[model samples]
Structure formats: C-alpha cells, structure tokens
Target: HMESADLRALAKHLYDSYIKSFPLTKAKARAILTGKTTDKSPFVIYDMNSLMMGEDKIEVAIRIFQGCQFRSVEAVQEITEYAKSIPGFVNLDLNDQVTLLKYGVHEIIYTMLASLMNKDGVLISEGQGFMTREFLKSLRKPFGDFMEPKFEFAVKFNALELDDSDLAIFIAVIILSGDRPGLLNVKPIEDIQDNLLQALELQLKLNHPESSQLFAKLLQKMTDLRQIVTEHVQLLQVIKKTETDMSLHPLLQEIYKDL
Candidate 1:
C-alpha cells in the first residue's frame, strides 16, 4: 500500500523519466504544427505522387516501414528506462521484466505517437513537416493498412489531451500489466499495477476534472493499442510471405514473430 506521499513521489519519478527519455513534449508538437519549428532533418516517407512505378513502390514502402521500425527499437530502449523508473519494477523477476517489455513496448510507442499526432497527420523526422494520413493511405495494402489504425488510435488518443504526467503513469500501468503472457510472477506485478491505476485515477481527476469520461476512455485506449499492435504483427507476417527478400530488424523479428 502506498501512502499519499509515496504515490506522489512515484508519479513524479515516472513523469520525469518519461519526459527525459522521450523528449517529445507538447510544446515541440505545437511548434511543429504551427510551422514555428525550424529543425528540419532530412527524413523520408513514401510519397504517393513521387512513387510512379509498381515494383519499386513496395520496396519504397518497405524502406519507410523499416525506418519506422528502427525508430520503434530506439523507443524500446527509452521505454525500458521509463519502466525501470517505476517503483518496484526492477524488483520483479528479470525474465518477467523482459517479457513485459517485449509485449508492452509497441503499446507504449503508439501511445506516445499521440503526442506528435493530430487530426491532420503526424510530424515526422524531428518536425520536418506534417505527413498527411491520406498520403500514408496511398501506399499499397499490407503496408498502407499497417499505419492507418495506429493513426486512428493516435487521433482519438490526442483528443484526450493528456500531458506527459498523465502519459507517464498510463505507460507504467501498461508495462506492468499482469496479463502479458509468460510472466513468472504475476501477483507482485498486479499489485504494483493496481497502485499505478489508483495513481492514474488521481492524476486524471487532477488534470481533467471536467471530463469524467477521460479515465475509462484512457483504459479503453490501452486495449485499442493492444489490438492495433496485434494487427501490425499480423500484417508484417503477410509481408514476410509476400516479400521474402525484405529483412526485418533482428530486434523486431523477435518481438513480431509468426512469419
């Protein structure tokens, strides 16, 4: 049982670690959206207009998604640090931690994606510019379908308008979930997660008192993210069958299997 002081401290540490690791703040998103941001690093996504040929299109799509996967892997490391900052997280069995991370990282990645997304599109490549959802939709099936649902999740999640503090506890609850398969020690994990849930409720109440729907809706979004990731993995398997030559990053290969 966490005292009020302990709970607040826990939330503070989690938020700090999350902001430190992610560094993609609401201000940055605002700057990118408003065209006030000047940091344009060269990054590419498959452009529907420029990609004129059929055979090379999937190859271009493959590179785009592969680039995104590398970003996902970087996110996995940041998420690992974020998880470790959760009180009692490291105390859990090592194998349990790995299992939790393996399944939970993608979920966290999509949740954080909401930070950089709005109704229009996401800000890519360190605020280079907005990449429209319609543009992503232009890619061929299997590849194009993969990103749509994630944007769907992000758009709705962004509607919640949660700040990093809310997201911190939210992500902690996600990573500490006991339902992830093959966890050796579930009870302690659940206990830790229960405390996080309580803390999250308190956070939402503080951050968004006008909206009673926010807390439950946020929980629902977690389930949404889970399904989205499942579909993502399934789509990747489809690509594996169709595009045998396209290699996946070894790290992603371990996490997204069944090919």
Candidate 2:
C-alpha cells in the first residue's frame, strides 16, 4: 500500500514529467489558435461584396481535423511514453497498460485540448488557424458538427485556466482512472486513481484558494471528455464511410471498433 507521502511524491513526479514531456507551450499553443500557419491555412480569403462568404467548407473542415489528428497523435505518443515511467502504471500488467492507453488515449487528448484553446476557438493548423464555434455550424453537417461541440467543452474546460503543472497531474488522473468503462480489474487501478485524485485535489486547492468548485468542476469536465470521446469516435465512423484517404491510426481504429 502506498503511503500518503509516497503518493504525494508520485503526484509531484508525474507533474514534473508531464510538464517536461508536453510539446506545446503557452506561446506556441496561443499562436496556433490565431490563424497563424506554415502555409497560413484557413487562409481566410474574404469576398468584397459577398463579404459573408467563407472558406471552402470541406477544406476548412478537413484542415481542422488534420490539425486535430496531428496534435492528437502526438499527444497519445507522448503521454504513453511518460506514463511508462510512472511507478503505478509500470506496475500494471503490460496488457492492461496497453488496453488503458488504447481506449484511454482519445479522452486524454481532449484534456490536452484545453491547452490549445482560447476564449474564441481551437487552433487548427499547427498554430496557424482558427475556427469559431459559429463558423463550425455554418459548415456542412456531420464533419462541421464535429468541431464546435468539441470546442464548446474545450472553451468551458479552459475557462478554469489550469496550468501545465496542474494539467499534467489532472491528465495523470484521467489516464489512471479505473472508473472508466473498460477496466478489466478495477480494485487495484481504483486504488491508484484514488491516490492520484487525492493528491490532485490537494494541489488544486493549494494553487487556487479563490474558488471551491475547482476540483468538482474538473471532475464534471471529465464526464464531458468521456462524452466527447464518444462523439469523436462517431465522427471517425463518418470519416471512414466518407473519406477513404484519411489516415486513421491503427490503435485509434481498434479503439473505435469496440466503441
């Protein structure tokens, strides 16, 4: 059994590791959302008289998801590698670890979305594009629908203003969750999750004494993440049916297969 001090040490270690591992920084993340681009995509070209005109719907939509795909794949890869160093995570059976990563990766990516957002919307093209909630709805059905709801949760989640230190701990909590549906053996995993959550709450309150709902609200957003993961998988289903050339990660495909 891990002692409180040991668990506390675990929390600090994960926080440090996560801060070190995450690729996107505050500046880069902010830049990504401001229509800044390599090719300068979403290259929003406005019409003079028909000023109400927008970028090509399909292109806007595809580029946005392409941004998501790149970030999301990167996130999963980084998180999986960091999680490997955690004592509790390494202690789990290798098979259980893979199952957790396979199913849990997308949900964790949503948590990372908070970092990629601002008061407006998410950055689409490597920090070079922006997609507003309103503009997403104006987009064609299904594909367009994919982004706004995601940003809705993201906007609200980022409203909490959790920093990298906090997010690392929070994401660790998310990944170690034994409460998520697919866990084959819940007790031991639950024990680790409980320890991490306790440490997270302590640190959360210590960091922000200004509000009481900080921890509770974060838990609520985890539910938000779960639902969003479901929607994401469904969107992938749409993409699988509609767009043949889009590259879907094998692990993500396997996760979606069960969902």
Candidate 3:
C-alpha cells in the first residue's frame, strides 16, 4: 500500500536500464557481415508520420509467411532475453516463469510487427519489400487468412507512429501483462506491470511532449494487441486442426499448446 512510490521507483529504474535502444539498418548489418565493423548504436531516427504510399496495396502471401516466420522467431528470442533479465521476473516460481515465457513470444511479436510497419505494410528485405493489406489477403488458403489480420493490426498501430523508445517500453508492457493466461505471482507481477505502465505513461509524454493523446491512444493499441493475439492463437489452432504436417518451430508449437 505505502510502496506505491517504491513501485514507481522500481519501475523507473527498470525502464531506464532495460529499454532497447533501437534497431540497425541493413547497411550496418552488411558492414558487420563484410568485415569492417566498428562501434554502433541500434537506435536510429525516422520520419514515421510521413507518406510511404504506393501504386496499390499488395504482397505475396507465401513470402509474407516466410519473412514473418523468421522475424517472429527472432523477435521472440529477443523478447525472452529481455523478460528474463527483469529482476522480479525470475523471482516467480520456475513453472510460472516458464509459462509466462511460453506465451511471451506470441504476446510481443505483434509489437515487433507494429514497429516494422508503415502505411503500406511492414518492411522486409530491407525497405526493398513492402507488403500491402489487399495483397496479404489474396494468398492461398489458411496462411492468407492468418496473416491478413496481422498486417491489418500492424498498419493501424503504426499510424500512431511511435519511435524506438516508445516501441521499447511498449513491449515490456505486453510481456509484464498481468492478464496473461497463467500467472502464479499476480500481485508482484502486476506491481511490476504497474511500474512499467507508469514508466511508459510518463515516457510517452516525455518522448512526445507536444502530443496530448499519444499515451491514451497507445493504451488502446495494447488492448487491440490482446485481441490480435487471441485471433492468432485461434488461427494457429485451426492450422493445427487442418494442416497437421505444417513445419512450425517447436518452441512456437510449445507456446501454442501451453499458452
């Protein structure tokens, strides 16, 4: 009760300490790969609210599956490491901790998708590949249905135009979410979640000081995220029911069953 400020203090500390800086461009990746690498910051700047329009909205569903699959896998690993690093996270019972992580990746991948998105859709193969909403829906069968809504969610969420810092804290909010299916340490988890939420609320203002609506709007997006994740979980279940031979990753599959 009296530790509200302490909760806020812990939240502030974790927020400042653990937030992801930003991501690198392909040019930087190539530089590292081709061997003349030096110091770098993952954080980069962008004009998010600007136009990224094109002739029409479109993308191949199969390619959408491939790219998103890789990115989803990558995003989960990164999210997991960050979650385990949080101080109170490991303090939970091991089974509870594992369960949180079991569903953890799925909960956070949409935010990664949202961060990668633009008006057209998410950027893949660097900025060379841009998928549109209509194109995503036109692909064959189950895969097409599964992906279209994901792209739709990303497109709308991206319209809010959060920067790397905003994206950073937002993912933490999703992972620390108290409402996830299973949580043994609800109070502590919620306390930590409350901290992160407060930190995000304050930082959203600091990051976009002139904007009045960003914080509330972003919270709404978080709700939207829960809906998308539920939709995704159901879609995955259907895929399992119909397409038994699908080559999904074991970790992802494990999440599907337990989460």
Candidate 4:
C-alpha cells in the first residue's frame, strides 16, 4: 500500500519520461493533415505511396515497416530511462534488472503504440505519417500477416481511452512483472508490481469512476499483451529463416537471442 501523494509522484515521473521519450502525440498527428495549423512541419505522410502499384510494392512496404522497427530502438533507450524513474527498479540486482527489462520492453513498446493508433491505422515516423491496417495486410505471406494482431490489440486498447498518467502506471506494471522467465529474485519484483497494481487501480477509479470494471479489464489486456508478444517472437523467428537479407538491429538481436 502506498500513499496517494506517492502514487501521484510515481505517475508524474513516469508520464514526464514517457512524453520526453516519445513525442508522438495524437493531437499533433491530427493537426498534421487537418490543415488547421500552418507550422511548416517536417511532416511527411507515408501511406505507402499510392503511385507505386508495381511489382516491388511488397518490397517497398517491407522496407517502410523495417524502418519503423529501427526507430523503435529509440524507445528501448527511453524505456530504460523511464524504468530508472521507478522507485525500486534501480535498486534491484543488476542482472535481474536487465532480465526484467529485456523481457518486458516489447510489451512497453506495444502499450505506448496505442498513442499512434486509430481503428483504421497507426501514425508512423514520429507522427509524420500514417500506415493503414489494410496496407499492412496487403503485403505478401508473413509480411502481410505479421502485424495484424498488434493493430487488433491497439484498436481494442484505444477503446479504454487511457491518458498519459494512466499509461504511466501501466508501463510500470508491465516492467515490474514477476512472470518473466529467469528471475533470481521474484519477491521484490512482485512487491513492486503489487504496489503498481494498486496505483493503477486507484488511478483508474479516480479517472473513470463510471466504469466499474476498467481495472479488471486492463488486467485482461495484459494477458492479451503476453500472447501478442509470444506470437511476435514466433513471427520474428519465421522472418529470420525466410528473409535472409533482412537484419535485426543489435538491440533486437540481443533481446531475441535467448527466445
């Protein structure tokens, strides 16, 4: 159990780190194409270039998606910073800390991806562009099928309408999970997770008083998150075997090496 003031501080620190680490905001994305603001933005829409209805369209689409994966590395570093802000995260044994982060960062990334999603698509390239679900599904074979679950998960998650403060605790809850494999010390991790779970429940009740089951439902979504991460790893394995030319960033390489 934690004091309200302590929970507020935790959420504030996590929220601030989240905004700093990921500047992709839905409002600005809406503004990018709405023509309401003439700010001369570096905004470029990447809708897969409608003019390229040629033989290499799948190739081009794969490259664009790969580029987004590359950019996701930025979040890995940012999540590390945010994780450090968690009160007990840094005090954990160093190897345990790395293990938790390695196991959990993808879940964190997908949770944050909610910011960039609508039912139809997600904003890419730092909110400069949009990638439609249809476009992703149109790719060939594994490439076509790779991200449908993410989009599906995003669409459902967006329904919860969580704000940065809410998501702040959510990310903490993810990283502090006790279920990740190969943990030397599970007690401290579960202790932190329990506190964060309460923080999340309190925040949700405060924020969404009308929705009686929101906290329970969010826990259900965490179950979905685990399934999605498992499938993602499996798909990555398939890509490794088939797409020999495609390469993972060293960070991704290390994260996936054991799995």
Better of 3 and 4 by lDDT: 4
**Ranking of all predicted structures according to TM-score, beginning with the best and ending with the worst:** 4, 1, 2, 3
- State which candidate, 2 or 3, has the greater TM-score: 2
- The runs of at least 3 residues in candidate 4 whose Cα sits more than 4 Å from the true structure, single-residue gaps closed, are 26-58
lDDT of 3 by residue, 105-194 (tens): 675677766555544444554343345555555567888678678768876876776765566567777777667676777788888777
Residue 8 displacement (Å), model 3:
10
Cα lDDT, model 4, residue 63: 82
TM-score of each: 0.88, 0.79, 0.72, 0.88
Q: How do the residues 55-139 of candidate 4 rate in per-residue lDDT, one tens digit apiece?
A: 1432665685577678678889888988988889999999989999999999988888766777677666565455667877777
Cα RMSD, model 1: 4.1
Per-residue lDDT of candidate 2, residues 1-259 (tens digit): 4566775676689877876776665446755455446643443322221223433432555655665677677777888887876658888876778777876788878777767766555555444445555665555656667766777777788788787767777777777877655667777778878887888887788778897879998888888888888877767787778776566766556666665
lDDT of each: 0.78, 0.70, 0.63, 0.79
Q: Relative to the unseen true structure, what is the C-alpha lDDT of residue 85 in candidate 2, on a scale of 0 to 100?
A: 66
Reference-based TM-score, model 2:
0.79
Q: Give the CA lDDT, 0 to 100, for residue 211 in model 4.
A: 89
